[PDB]
Design brief:
The chain is an alpha+beta fold and 152 residues long. It has a single domain, classed as endopeptidase domain like (from Nostoc punctiforme) (endopeptidase fold (from Nostoc punctiforme), Alpha-Beta Complex). The chain is built from 5 helices and 6 strands. The protein has a 6-stranded antiparallel sheet. A hairpin with a 6-residue loop joins strand 2 and strand 3. Helix 1 packs across helix 2. The longest helix is centred in the first third of the chain and has 12 residues. It is globular. The PDB classes it as hydrolase. Keywords: NlpC/P60 domain, hydrolase. It forms a monomeric assembly. The entry is titled "Crystal structure of type effector Tse1 C30A mutant from Pseudomonas aeruginousa". The protein is Putative uncharacterized protein.
């Protein structure tokens, strides 16, 4: 679908290290920074809490996880994010079926390891704890990053 460029950027960014020596799979903010860089989307600098702070200040916030999945399906970069006392978390929302009819699928790395990692096969409602997953913010960029289908 129209989110193919976002999925491709996620796949490409998985193996990169936005901060030298730190695999993006082990760094939520770094993973998102690499995805945005590939897509040509400007991003606030810093760790996950800093990124959420910047997005809160500058990006449109969507109303729900369903809407997040819809915008991703239109070729928009959508970031799910939530600040933490110690560490925040950020993830790229992709098109796909909603877990428990609520929570969209995502890609993300994490300092926490496997529980915080997703290669498109965990939903935000499994990456985040039950006490967090209904408190997420979904931020959408102001234009669609993906392109027209191949002309030929």
């Amino acid at each position: 679908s129209l989110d193919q460029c976002i999925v491709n950027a996620c796949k490409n960014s998985w193996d990169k290290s936005y901060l030298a020596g730190t695999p993006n799979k082990d760094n939520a903010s770094g993973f998102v920074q690499s995805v945005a860089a590939e897509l040509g989307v400007p991003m606030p600098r810093g760790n996950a809490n800093a990124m959420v702070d910047g997005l809160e200040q500058s990006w449109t916030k969507l109303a729900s996880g369903a809407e997040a999945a819809q915008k991703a399906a239109q070729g928009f970069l959508v970031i799910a994010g939530l600040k933490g006392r110690t560490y925040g978390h950020v993830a790229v929302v992709i098109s796909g079926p909603l877990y428990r009819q609520k929570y969209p699928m995502c890609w993300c790395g994490s300092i926490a390891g496997a529980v915080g990692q997703s290669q498109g096969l965990k939903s935000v409602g499994q990456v985040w704890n039950r006490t967090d997953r209904d408190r997420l913010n979904y931020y959408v960029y102001s234009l669609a990053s993906c392109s027209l289908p191949r002309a030929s």
